[PDB]
Design a protein around this nucleic acid. Sequence first.
RNA 1: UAACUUCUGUGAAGUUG
Length: 151
Amino acid sequence: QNPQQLSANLWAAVRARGCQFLGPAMQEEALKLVLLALEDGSALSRKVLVLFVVQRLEPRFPQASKTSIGHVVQLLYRASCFKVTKRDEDSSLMQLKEEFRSYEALRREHDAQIVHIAMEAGLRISPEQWSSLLYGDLAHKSHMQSIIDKL
RNA sequence: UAACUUCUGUGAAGUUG
């Protein structure tokens, strides 16, 4: 496959899982807001986490909605980033696992989950293309290479 | 990379196009 087919097939696979990558700038800001809410160990319902993030992104990002931010939260959920507390007959509460309570750690797990989805879908994407896809530059090749090699 | 809505989702369904 050419780069364009790889990209389209990747986002199809991500979306098929109820997840979304919103673009490099917006995704970064969304993840920073998840941290802002959860880095201190607060236990939020999925609904309240999404509200926290959406409200802060809406001024800058017309893409921001409960739907689009929900997709980002789902990506982190699928990546096992949350300690989930079940409550009988009620909404579960979510905390960030202690190991993911910094941007570097959370972002790495996020990126690894998208690479994992690519692998699930049979897509072989170079570190160069990964850097472009997830960061909009070619400066994150070594980072993506590390993720690929640890997967 | 269809948008949105509901939902306790390693995910579902619905509305619109």
